[PDB]
Structures are given as structure tokens and as C-alpha cells.
Amino acid sequence: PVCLVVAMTPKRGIGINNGLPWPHLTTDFKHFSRVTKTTPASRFNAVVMGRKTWESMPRKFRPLVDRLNIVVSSSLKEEDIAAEKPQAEGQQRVRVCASLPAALSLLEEEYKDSVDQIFVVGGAGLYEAALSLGVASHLYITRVAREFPCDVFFPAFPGDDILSNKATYRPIFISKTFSDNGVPYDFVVLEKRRSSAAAIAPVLAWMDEELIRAVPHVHFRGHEEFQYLDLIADIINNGRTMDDRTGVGVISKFGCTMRYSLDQAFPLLTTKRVFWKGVLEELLWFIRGDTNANHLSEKGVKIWDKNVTREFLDSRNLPHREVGDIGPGYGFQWRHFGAAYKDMHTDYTGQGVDQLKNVIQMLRTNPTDRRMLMTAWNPAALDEMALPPCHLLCQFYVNDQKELSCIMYQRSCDVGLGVPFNIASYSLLTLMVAHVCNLKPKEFIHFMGNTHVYTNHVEALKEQLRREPRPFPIVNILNKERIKEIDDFTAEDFEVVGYVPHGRIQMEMAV
Amino acid sequence: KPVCLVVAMTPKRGIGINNGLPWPHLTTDFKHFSRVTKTTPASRFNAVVMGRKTWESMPRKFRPLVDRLNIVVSSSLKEEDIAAEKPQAEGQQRVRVCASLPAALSLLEEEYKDSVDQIFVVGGAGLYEAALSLGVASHLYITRVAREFPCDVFFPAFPGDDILSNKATYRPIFISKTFSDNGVPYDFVVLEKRRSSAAAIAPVLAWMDELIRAVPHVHFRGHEEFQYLDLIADIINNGRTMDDRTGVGVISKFGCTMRYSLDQAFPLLTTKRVFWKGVLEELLWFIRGDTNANHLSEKGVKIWDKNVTREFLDSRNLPHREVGDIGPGYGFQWRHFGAAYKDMHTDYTGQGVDQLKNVIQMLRTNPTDRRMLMTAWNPAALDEMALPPCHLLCQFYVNDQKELSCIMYQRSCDVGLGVPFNIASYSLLTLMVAHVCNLKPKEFIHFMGNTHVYTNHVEALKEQLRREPRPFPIVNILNKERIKEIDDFTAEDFEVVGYVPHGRIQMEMAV
Numbered sequence A: 001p002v003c004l005v006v007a008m009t010p011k012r013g014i015g016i017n018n019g020l021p022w023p024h025l026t027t028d029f030k031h032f033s034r035v036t037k038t039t040p041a042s043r044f045n046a047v048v049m050g051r052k053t054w055e056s057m058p059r060k061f062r063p064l065v066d067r068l069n070i071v072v073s074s075s076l077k078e079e080d081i082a083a084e085k086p087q088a089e090g091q092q093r094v095r096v097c098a099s100l101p102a103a104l105s106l107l108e109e110e111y112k113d114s115v116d117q118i119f120v121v122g123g124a125g126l127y128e129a130a131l132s133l134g135v136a137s138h139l140y141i142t143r144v145a146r147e148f149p150c151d152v153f154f155p156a157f158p159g160d161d162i163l164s165n166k167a168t169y170r171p172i173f174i175s176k177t178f179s180d181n182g183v184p185y186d187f188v189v190l191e192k193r194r195s196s197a198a199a200i201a202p203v204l205a206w207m208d209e210e211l212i213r214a215v216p217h218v219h220f221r222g223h224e225e226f227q228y229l230d231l232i233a234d235i236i237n238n239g240r241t242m243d244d245r246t247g248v249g250v251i252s253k254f255g256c257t258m259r260y261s262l263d264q265a266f267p268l269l270t271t272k273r274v275f276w277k278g279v280l281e282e283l284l285w286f287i288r289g290d291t292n293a294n295h296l297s298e299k300g301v302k303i304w305d306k307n308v309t310r311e312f313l314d315s316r317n318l319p320h321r322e323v324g325d326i327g328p329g330y331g332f333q334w335r336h337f338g339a340a341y342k343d344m345h346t347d348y349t350g351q352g353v354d355q356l357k358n359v360i361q362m363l364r365t366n367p368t369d370r371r372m373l374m375t376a377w378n379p380a381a382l383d384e385m386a387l388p389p390c391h392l393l394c395q396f397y398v399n400d401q402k403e404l405s406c407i408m409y410q411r412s413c414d415v416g417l418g419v420p421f422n423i424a425s426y427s428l429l430t431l432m433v434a435h436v437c438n439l440k441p442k443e444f445i446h447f448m449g450n451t452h453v454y455t456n457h458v459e460a461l462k463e464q465l466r467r468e469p470r471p472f473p474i475v476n477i478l479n480k481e482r483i484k485e486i487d488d489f490t491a492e493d494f495e496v497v498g499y500v501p502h503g504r505i506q507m508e509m510a511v
Numbered sequence B: 001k002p003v004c005l006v007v008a009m010t011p012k013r014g015i016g017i018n019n020g021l022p023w024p025h026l027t028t029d030f031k032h033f034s035r036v037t038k039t040t041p042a043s044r045f046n047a048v049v050m051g052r053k054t055w056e057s058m059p060r061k062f063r064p065l066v067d068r069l070n071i072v073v074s075s076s077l078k079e080e081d082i083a084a085e086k087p088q089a090e091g092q093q094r095v096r097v098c099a100s101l102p103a104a105l106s107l108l109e110e111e112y113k114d115s116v117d118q119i120f121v122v123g124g125a126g127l128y129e130a131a132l133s134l135g136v137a138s139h140l141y142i143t144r145v146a147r148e149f150p151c152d153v154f155f156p157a158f159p160g161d162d163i164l165s166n167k168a169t170y171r172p173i174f175i176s177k178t179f180s181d182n183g184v185p186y187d188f189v190v191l192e193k194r195r196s197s198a199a200a201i202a203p204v205l206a207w208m209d210e211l212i213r214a215v216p217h218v219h220f221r222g223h224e225e226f227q228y229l230d231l232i233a234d235i236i237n238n239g240r241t242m243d244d245r246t247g248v249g250v251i252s253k254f255g256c257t258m259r260y261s262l263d264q265a266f267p268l269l270t271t272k273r274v275f276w277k278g279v280l281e282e283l284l285w286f287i288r289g290d291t292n293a294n295h296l297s298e299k300g301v302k303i304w305d306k307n308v309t310r311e312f313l314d315s316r317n318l319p320h321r322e323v324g325d326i327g328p329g330y331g332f333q334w335r336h337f338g339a340a341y342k343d344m345h346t347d348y349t350g351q352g353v354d355q356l357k358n359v360i361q362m363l364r365t366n367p368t369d370r371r372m373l374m375t376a377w378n379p380a381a382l383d384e385m386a387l388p389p390c391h392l393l394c395q396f397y398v399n400d401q402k403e404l405s406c407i408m409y410q411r412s413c414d415v416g417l418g419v420p421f422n423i424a425s426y427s428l429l430t431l432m433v434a435h436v437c438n439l440k441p442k443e444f445i446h447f448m449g450n451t452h453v454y455t456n457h458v459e460a461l462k463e464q465l466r467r468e469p470r471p472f473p474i475v476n477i478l479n480k481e482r483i484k485e486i487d488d489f490t491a492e493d494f495e496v497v498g499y500v501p502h503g504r505i506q507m508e509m510a511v
């Protein structure tokens, strides 16, 4: 019973010019070091590698300490490796075998009592040979989210859908997303599947007296998206069937919380492609305090059209609104809170309270202040809006390390559709704000009120929950030097790096 | 050889009156009792042991207790006094009569080994006194009845009776949430005498894996107050030390949640006494839309005075504010959002948005509406306020079964002093609104922004955490018929039933 341990691009690339295709991945190496060494007393592990893999290592690190180094090679001799560097005392001498079947036979003969776990470390020669013989019980895969130029590739295998879109291998473990040198990645493991408390118990047994899960197989679920998935599953399992303003039935839960890290990667959800062009163009729209939805619509972003139609504005009891007008909406309250609205064309400069500018000036001069809030809810002008704000409130926070976090409260949540859009939108705002203030982005926290999935979306969401997440992408702000204030961002100032989602899921917007 | 004791108990240790139970029928208790005495892991059954009067107090259809070996301790009653009392059913075990508890335990070993699984002393005072003296009691199953009743028979005093009320040891290993039957709150505690299948997943868990705990013995944590206790513990252990607008050192955290049930009992926290006279007077102050802190100050609630002083009013740059005037405070926006403020004496009826009216109306008519929100935060009006509202927003949610839930978001949370007050203050509003809208109260959800403990409380809080919580009380609304609007309520229309909190800890208010 052997295990494979690899780092791998989406297109299964592993090496180039007999070296790693990426810049050094410190957290990947630490993870490698730990897996290959650790043991529950008397036994050391074994690291089986090829010649090209052995050679590609730095001289400093070979032989890999505390582990039986076995090199599969015909051309290299057992003494050339011995003459390469003097051996340090306390380690088994590096062993050379003809092929991989012969390599494991060596452990059967001479090391039957000493070795605990067996690890094949590279490369494509030994990996291919390992999967051929099928003696691999487990695969420890580091999924590099970014694509890199490669000439050596890891062989494709049943259930390699965990890398990109297309005896079996099922994921049992998915870690949260890590990053090094602007390279996002995460760790997965895959399985070859094909009376101190006796007194308490009966009190618990009677105490209960009273269906769907996200990716059942995956038992350790480090990935942060699991929040959102388990949140879908929960409302499908434990929510309440409700009616609606829209006329479409709803399953709703009240009081819901999600939080996502910003320090390593960006929570652009992977289980379905997120319309990022939308979250970007809409956020810049908000920041401008723009209330004209045509400016969005023309850019290819049609998210607001149905709620600013001639038909909808009349039902929303505003016959004197122009098509495209969202009223004094999200962005208007941010940049001009309380100001007298006229139309989308009127210039509202200097009028009202610019919450966004004050939130920054507070962050930049006095970050411990507890009044760093931006609201979109104005009970005075709710009726003048074409549709009341969902994401209505957000608070900011700085710690010791000059790291920035952001809470956002949402009154009403279309989990299937709006939520992943909302996560990504505000997390982006945190990145923007953090940069302008000279702070590290840390964490984004999502507070939810009415949290609901629409009944017509339910079939599509079970489809989404069969999908195990991919590593998060990195969002980079570009022209970091050129942008100094929050209004200096443009659409081209951003870069989504290594975003490899699952295929598009179609979901109708509830009018 | 070891025995378990199973009792229900008044805070004053009372167990009986007039050879019967002191309280009305508690179904959930009798359920607990039935299951705990009966449930057994094959060829095996449980023994129940009682006094003569316990046997007599018990209704005829229930004695002897089915599926359990009954033993009555008596010297007047004989074994044939009981056999003639009711024909024995086929299969059941005969009731045995011993003259003392040592004889009872002796009989159990002498004749009933290999026969009886577990031994339960069931009552009354005499046998509970006897069992505690012998030191044979391994576990105490206490049903803490929170309400004080007329009692002539009492459970004996024991080391560890600090779980009942204020003052070889008996410490809690289990505390459940508060239940209620017939206007009576209660909860269940258990006390203890002290004086590569999945292992291939575990190596990656090694490196990823890594001080103050409250009531650490309590292995089961049903009691919803544990949420708050652990929230204090987390802030201290895992928080970051910030400086403060007041100057006093702060340990703080961002984005933490709590939720409390309102269908069984009231989350008026028990681990320290909460100033309920304040929570009631402050809320009815808000409801009236009052901005005059002297109306609270004259009534014995001085919670706002340190913030309406001439010094603080001038430090907030408001020279013309009279002493007492909070400016457009929380009460003000609730009923007059956007109204132009003058002083506390000016009459504002009709001006601004009456959010509270709109909330109740939307509730009583269109409960599936998601715009059912109230907000104290008014960016344009913040400057004129003596203090920017801490609790700034609440949302209401109505269920399938006409069940009301409420979320409240609080930007800044004094976890030592303000948080339990706020839990109490909105749970009360939720009760009030529910009655006024003809709805069953279900849940209060607390969303928290800057969640912090002051450093001149750290010592005073570590002490509090040593205290395990008592059952929650019931808050009843008196004069239900007379009250039909939210303004109809007065301080007298309420009654806190079964409140048994721990001693007061002195915590100064930060100005």
C-alpha cells in the first residue's frame, strides 16, 4: 500500500526543464515535509523518487533527512550518489532500484519491520508506473490554481474532475486556499474507492425525540466554500416553505453567518462560475454613487434591467421614473446620504453625507474608532427606490497588525444567485479600501437576515452540491502606485489569478 | 455498588408539599424521569428505590413503576401491603420492602446481582439524606425547577448546591437549556462526585492543528448562556489589544454571533444579576421615542446620566444641549427617522419615519415581507447625537407557524456590561411585538460588530466564568387584553418569574 504526493497545475503540469514550473511554494514544501516524515514510534518513512527527480533537488536537501531515500534508476550507481557528498551519521544510505515493481520488493525484503508509510515523490515515470500497478491507496495532491508552462505531466486518472472541467479516485479531504508568490493552491487527499459519560447519555437520548448534504464523501472540509454549500444544504434540510412578493415559493432560514479569509486568496466561489465582471462593474458603479442602471446595462452587465423596466417602475408605484433609474439606491446613500434625489442625471456633488469618504478618513487617522460604518438603508427614501437594499450595512475594523476586516449585513438573501455575487462584491471592496488606507486585507464576515433558496432553483442547487470546490483565486490590484484614493480604481485595475471554477449553472432572476 | 439520585428541585431545595409535588404538571420532567430510570444497554433492568411517602404520593396507575424493580423503604409497610394494593402484571418485577437503605443495597447485591443494571434513589428527603451520608451516590440527576413554590419537604444540603441558588464534592458535568411547562421554567443538570482508513487523513491534520475556559468541567453545554460565557473566554484568549476612544485598554474581536430561544424561557442571563428594572425602563423610553435621560434618571436608572453630563455634552461639541438630552437618540429615530431635532422637550409626533409603526403593520398584514427592519443609525444626524447608537438595527421575521424571530446588529459590544443587557433588551421587544401582532415568540439572534471586553474587567470576568449558569426565567406579559398596541405597555405589565442569578460583580461604566 503506497501513497502519491504531488503538486499539480490545473492541466496536470508538474515540471519543466527538470525544475518546478512555479516560484517556490513554502507552504507546499512544509506540507510535503510533514506528510513524508510524521508517524504515530519505532518506524521511519520511505521516499521513492526517479533519477531526474533526485537530480533536480538541491545538493543541500538530498538525501531527504529522516526518510529512506530510494531512487529508481538504471544509469546511476549506488556509489556515485555516495561520492556526491559524505553521509551524515544516523540515516539509511540512498538506495537504487531497476524499476518501481522492483523498488517496493526491496522494502518487502530488507525493510519489512522499519518502514511505516511509503511515498512516491516523482516524477511522471514513477507516477505513471504507480497508477498502472494500482498499488496507490491514496493521493496527496497540491492543486496549484495557476497554470504554468510544463513539459512533464502527471497522468490523467478517473475522477480528475477535481483539477479542471472535462477503479476511481474520490476526494476525502479539501483544505482551505493558501498562497505564495502570487500563486494560489490548496491540498487535497484522494482515496482509491471503486462511566463518566455513560451517565450523561440517556438524558441526551430522550432529549431529541424528533436529508441532503454537501459532498458527502469529503470528511475533512477545510475549504471555506463549504460554508456556502452547507448553508444551501441546511436551508434545503431545515428551512421553511414560504410565499413571496415575487409570487415564486421560497424556503427560508433566519439568521445566517459566513466568514472568509482575505490574506491568502479571494473568495470567488468555485462550485459555479461567478459573474466577476458583474461584481466589479457594479461595485465601481456603487462607489461612483451612480443610480443609472443603463451605465451597467451597456457594459454587458444586465443584472439590474428587470428591476428598472417601464413595467416594474409603474408597479413599484413610480410612473415618473426613467427606465434605468434605481432611485436613491445603494451607491447614492453611500456617497450622498440624505440628499434630495431628482433623477439619475442630476449632479449630487457635495450634498448629503459621504459615508465612504468618512469611513476611510477614520480608518486612516483613527482606526480604533467603533463608528466606521456605511449604511444604504434610508427609511426616509425607501419608497423612492425601485427596490430596497439587500446588503444594507457594513462595518470596518482594524487590529494590531494593521489588518482590515469587514462585516456586511444583508436583510434578504437569494442563496443560489445573489449570495456568491455578494460575497465576492464586498470582499473586493475590502481589498480596495485596504489598499487606499495602507492596510492588509484580513477577513470578510457575512451577516444574513432572511436567507432563502427559491423553489425553482432547488433542482439546480442539488447539482451544485455534488461539486467539490476548487482552490480560490487571487485577486490582484494592479497599478498599486497610481491608485491613492477610493475613486481612483477603474475596471482594468484588477486581475483575477488562477480562477478554475466548475461549469456555468443557469438560474433565473426572480423579477 | 454505586447509586444515582434523580430529583426535581425548587431553588430553596424544596421537593414536596402535602405528600405531593409542589408545582403544576411538568410533562418534560416526567418524560426525562421515565427515560432515565428505564433505558438499559440485553438480559438486564434498572432498580428504583423510594420511601414510603413517595410511594403514597404517586398516582395508582403509575405504581409500581413499569419495567423497573421498585423498592420501598418502610417499617410500617410490609411486602404484602403492596401486593394486595394492585394485582401484579405478568412479566414485571415484584416490589420489595426494606427497613433501611443499607438493607436495600444489601438486598440488591444478595439477590439481584446479574439482574439489575442501575440503581436509582427516587425519593424522598429521608432516602436522599441517607444516600448522601453513605457516600454511595455517584451521580445526581437534578431537575432544577427555577420557580419558588410552597414546600414542606426538602432535598438535603450538599457540597455543590451552589448550582441551585446563592451561598467529597458534587460538580456539574451536564447543564441543559431551559424548558418550561405551565408557566414554570426548569432545566436538567447531572452532577458528579469528585472530591489508514481514516488515519491516512490525519497526517495533514497534524501541522494544521494547534487557555481560559469557563466551567470547563461541564462537558455538555446545552444552556444557551454558555454562548455568552464562551464568547467572553474567546475574546480574552484570542482577541487583539486595542487602545480606545476613552483611553482604557481593550481586548476585542470582530463578527461574533449568539442566538437565544424565546419559546420556552427568557434569556435574562443568570451568571451575574442583570438590572432588569433598567432594561424595561430603557426600552419603554425608546418606544415613547424619548430623548430625555432625566426621565430614566428620576426612575432609578442612571445608565445614561454619565453620557448626558455637561462635561460629556461639551466634549461631544454640543454646548446648547440641556442636561439629559441624548440628542436624536435611538428612541428618536425608531419613531421619527429623519425628523429635524430641536430639544428633548419639543413634540415630534408625526414628523419623520415611524419605523416601529411600519414594522408592526407589515407584521400584522404581510408577514412574508423582507423589508421588516428598524434602524437607529442616521449618518446625517450622528453629529447631533450625544452618542452614536451601539444597537443600530433590528430585523423581524415571521415563520410558517406565526413564529416571530428577531435579529439585532450591534456595532460595538461591551461584553462585560452591555451585552447581557442588550440580549435582554431586544428579547423583551420581541416578546412585546409578538403579543401586539398576535404571534408566538421563537428566537432572538444577536449579531455583533466590535465585540470587546475592557481590561479593567478582565479579573472581574475570569471570576464570572467560574460560575455555571442557572435556568433562565420566564417573563410574562401581564394584562394581555388591555395591551393591543406597542405604546399600550407600561412598566407594570411585566413579571419576571423564577429568576435566580449569581452575585453582583462591580463593573464601572466607561464614559
Ligand SMILES: NC(=O)C1=CN([C@@H]2O[C@H](COP(=O)(O)OP(=O)(O)OC[C@H]3O[C@@H](n4cnc5c(N)ncnc54)[C@H](OP(=O)(O)O)[C@@H]3O)[C@@H](O)[C@H]2O)C=CC1
Pocket: A005, A006, A007, A008, A013, A014, A015, A016, A017, A018, A019, A020, A021, A049, A050, A051, A052, A053, A054, A056, A072, A073, A074, A075, A098, A099, A100, A121, A122, A123, A124, A125, A126, A129, A152
Ligand atoms: N510537482 C511535483 O510534485 C514534482 C515535480 N517534479 C518535477 O518532475 C520532473 C522530473 O520528473 P520526470 O521528468 O518525470 O523524471 P522522473 O523523476 O520520472 O525520472 C526519470 C528517470 O528515472 C528512471 N525511472 C523513472 N521511473 C521509472 C520506472 N517506472 N522504471 C524504471 N525506471 C524509471 C528512468 O531512468 P532510465 O532512463 O535509466 O530508465 C528515467 O530516466 C522535474 O521537472 C521536477 O521538477 C519532481 C518532484 C515533485
Ligand SMILES: NC(=O)C1=CN([C@@H]2O[C@H](COP(=O)(O)OP(=O)(O)OC[C@H]3O[C@@H](n4cnc5c(N)ncnc54)[C@H](OP(=O)(O)O)[C@@H]3O)[C@@H](O)[C@H]2O)C=CC1
Pocket: B006, B007, B008, B009, B015, B016, B017, B018, B019, B020, B021, B022, B050, B051, B052, B053, B054, B055, B057, B073, B074, B075, B076, B077, B099, B100, B101, B122, B123, B124, B125, B126, B127, B130, B153
Ligand atoms: N420532586 C421530587 O423529586 C420528589 C418529591 N417527592 C416528594 O416528597 C414527599 C415524600 O417524601 P418524604 O416526605 O421525604 O417521605 P419519604 O418518601 O422519604 O418516605 C418517608 C418514609 O420512608 C421511610 N424511610 C425513609 N428514609 C428512611 C431512613 N433513612 N431510615 C428509615 N426509614 C426511612 C420511613 O418509613 P416508615 O415510617 O414506614 O419506617 C418514612 O416514614 C412527597 O410530598 C413527594 O411529592 C418524592 C420523590 C421525588
Ligand SMILES: C#CCN(Cc1ccc2[nH]c(N)nc(=O)c2c1)c1ccc(C(=O)N[C@@H](CCC(=O)O)C(=O)O)cc1
Pocket: A273, A274, A275, A278, A303, A304, A307, A414, A417, A418, A419, A420, A421, A422, A507, A508, A509, A510, A511
Ligand atoms: C446579488 C446581486 C446583484 N444583483 C441585483 C439583483 C436584484 C434583484 C434580485 N432578485 C433576486 N430574487 N435574486 C437576485 O439575485 C437579485 C439580484 C443581481 C441580479 C441578477 C443576477 C443574476 O442573474 N445572476 C448572474 C450570476 C452571478 C453570480 O454568479 O452570482 C447571472 O448569471 O446573470 C446576479 C446579481
Ligand SMILES: C#CCN(Cc1ccc2[nH]c(N)nc(=O)c2c1)c1ccc(C(=O)N[C@@H](CCC(=O)O)C(=O)O)cc1
Pocket: B272, B273, B274, B275, B278, B303, B304, B307, B414, B417, B418, B419, B420, B421, B422, B509, B510, B511
Ligand atoms: C447596554 C446598555 C444600556 N446602558 C447604557 C450604556 C451607556 C454607555 C455605556 N458605555 C459602556 N462603555 N458600556 C456600557 O455598557 C454602556 C451602557 C447601560 C449602561 C450601564 C449599565 C450598568 O451600569 N450595568 C447595570 C448592570 C446590568 C448587568 O449586570 O448586566 C447596572 O447595574 O447599572 C447598564 C446598561
Ligand SMILES: COc1ncc(-c2cccc(N3CCN(c4cnc(N)nc4N)CC3)c2)cn1
Pocket: A005, A006, A007, A020, A023, A024, A028, A029, A032, A057, A058, A061, A121, A122, A140, A141, A142
Ligand atoms: C525555487 O527553489 C526551489 N524549488 C524547489 C526545491 C526543491 C528541493 C527539494 C525537493 C523538491 N521537490 C521534491 C518534491 N516536490 C513536491 C512538492 N510538493 C508536493 N506536494 N509534492 C512533491 N513531490 C517538489 C520538488 C524541490 C528547492 N528550491
Ligand SMILES: COc1ncc(-c2cccc(N3CCN(c4cnc(N)nc4N)CC3)c2)cn1
Pocket: B006, B007, B008, B021, B025, B029, B030, B033, B058, B059, B062, B122, B123, B141, B142, B143
Ligand atoms: C398532578 O399530576 C401528577 N403529579 C405527579 C405525578 C407523579 C407520577 C409518578 C411519579 C411522581 N413522582 C414525584 C416526582 N418524581 C420525580 C420527578 N422528577 C425528578 N427529576 N425526580 C423525581 N424523583 C418521582 C416520583 C409523580 C403524576 N401525576
Ligand SMILES: O=c1ccn([C@H]2C[C@H](O)[C@@H](COP(=O)(O)O)O2)c(=O)[nH]1
Pocket: A245, A387, A388, A390, A391, A412, A413, A414, A415, A417, A418, A419, A422, B370, B371
Ligand atoms: O444583492 C442582492 C440583491 C438582491 N438579492 C435578492 C434577495 C431578494 O430575494 C431579492 C430582493 O427582494 P426583496 O428582498 O426586496 O423582497 O433579491 C440578493 O440576494 N442580493
Ligand SMILES: O=c1ccn([C@H]2C[C@H](O)[C@@H](COP(=O)(O)O)O2)c(=O)[nH]1
Pocket: A370, A371, B245, B387, B388, B390, B391, B412, B413, B414, B415, B418, B419, B422
Ligand atoms: O446599548 C449599549 C450601549 C453601550 N454599549 C457599550 C459598547 C461600547 O463599549 C460603548 C460605546 O462606545 P463607542 O463604541 O461609542 O466608542 O458602550 C453597549 O454595548 N450597548
